Each structure stands twice: as C-alpha cells, then as structure tokens.
Amino acid sequence: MTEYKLVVVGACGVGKSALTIQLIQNHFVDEYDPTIEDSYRKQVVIDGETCLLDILDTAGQEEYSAMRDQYMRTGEGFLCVFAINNTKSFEDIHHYREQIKRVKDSEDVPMVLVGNKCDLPSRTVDTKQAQDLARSYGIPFIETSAKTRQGVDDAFYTLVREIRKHKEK
Ligand SMILES: Nc1nc2c(ncn2[C@@H]2O[C@H](COP(=O)(O)OP(=O)(O)O)[C@@H](O)[C@H]2O)c(=O)[nH]1
Ligand SMILES: [Mg+2]
C-alpha cells in the first residue's frame, strides 16, 4: 500500500509529540519527555486511498548530524509546527524552512505550517502574521489544538495532499 514518510519539526515545547499522539492514538498527552524522538505508523484512508503514514516525531539535536540529514533526505513531507503563544517558536520556522531545503537541495519540498495550542487564550502570534509567512512560502497554514483535536486530521491530511501534488509533476 502507498506509504507517506512524514516528519514533524519545530522548536521544543510546541506540541509535536502531542499532535502526533493525538493522530495515532486519539488521546491528549499532558506530559511526554521532550527528549524522546520516535516514529509511529498508522493506516488511514485519505480521499479514498488506503495508505500508511510513517511519522517521525523529532526532538531536535541528534547524536550525529548525519542522522538529521538522513531523516530530512528520506522524509517526503514536513509539518512545521510553532505554538501560537511562543513568538520565538514562530521565528524559528525560518530556520527549519532553510535547513530542510538545504539538506534536500531542492526549492520545492512539501510542507505545511501549523500553529498549535489554539485552545489557549494566551496568543502572541496572530493569525494574520502566520498567514503572511505561509503565503511567502507558498504552503498551507492550519491552526490546531492537540488538546481538543481541532485541525489535527486536516494538518496531516493536507500534508499528504501536498506530497501527492509534488509527485504528479
Ligand atoms: N493547551 C494545549 N497544550 C498543549 C497542546 N499541545 C501540546 N501541549 C502541551 O505543551 C507541552 C509540550 O508539548 P509536547 O508535545 O511535549 O511538545 P514537543 O516538545 O514539541 O514534542 C505539554 O505540556 C503538552 O501537554 C495544545 O494544543 N494545547
Ligand atoms: Mg516531543
């Protein structure tokens, strides 16, 4: 069956693990070690296609930089996550965008921008600012809450749709 290799990236504490576990196991985890990097696999149906998602929940630095380059080269699409109450995590998106393009040596890499924690009242990044960034990249932007599940399926399924558009060229 068709397999999609997805990679979830972003600053520590933005909800990469909480998003991934909500997608896979349909519950919200309040505490999950920030240093754990692991992969998950789930069979889903997206637009009538039965497919397997192979999702890498990243944790930042690797023992050797070759491990980072390896997962960036093999990953087919990237979910770039910031938290709407953490401006530094939004600014870090620039770094992930650049680094992924640099390792893949491609200007066209399937990506979706995710503003997570949208259930919280505290917000430092308004929606307009994130829409402006996504527009400059030419990629979709989705606001999510790993806690309420709002937007979670849309974020991952949209990324699959971006991969499919990239492959048909
Ligand atoms: N309120 C709220 N908290 C969240 C959300 N996503 C993650 N968290 C919390 O934010 C903290 C960091 O989340 P985590 O998934 O470990 O972030 P990671 O370092 O990016 O993997 C944890 O305490 C989670 O419970 C969300 O959508 N809403
Ligand atoms: Mg984590």
Q: Are strands 49-57 and 2-9 parallel, antiparallel or unpaired?
A: parallel
Give Cα 120 to chain centroid, integer Å.
19
Burial-class residue 169 by CB neighbours within 10 Å (0-12, 13-18, 19+). Answer: exposed
Q: What distance in Å separates the CA atoms of residue 29 and residue 31, rounded to the nearest whole number?
A: 6
User: CA-based diameter of the chain, in Å?
Assistant: 42
Q: Provide the b/e sequence for 104-142 (b: ≥16 CB within 10 Å).
A: beeeebbbbbbbbbbeeeeeebeeeebeebbeebebbbb
Of how many residues is the chain composed? 169
Residue owning the nearest CA to atom 14 of ligand 1: 15
Q: What is the span of the domain harbouring residue 19?
A: 2-166
Q: What distance in Å separates the CA atoms of residue 153 and residue 150, rounded to the nearest whole number?
A: 8
- Are 145 and 117 contacting, i.e. CB atoms less than 8 angstroms apart? yes
CATH number at residue 69: 3.40.50.300
- Which residues surround the ion ligand 2 when the cut-off is CB under 5 Å? 16-17
Task: Determine the atom of ligand 1 nearest the C-alpha atom of 118.
Answer: 27
Ligand nearest to the CA of 32: 1
Given in angstroms, what resolution was this structure solved at? 1.4
Task: Determine the atom of ligand 1 nearest the C-alpha atom of 18.
Answer: 15
Ligand 1 center from residue 142 Cα (angstroms) = 16
Structure tokens at 131: 């829409």
Ligand nearest to the CA of 22: 1
Which residues have C-beta atoms less than 6 Å from ligand 1? 12-18, 30, 32, 34, 116-117, 119-120, 145-147
Question: How many domains would you assign to the chain?
Answer: 1
Look up residue 154 and give its amino acid: D
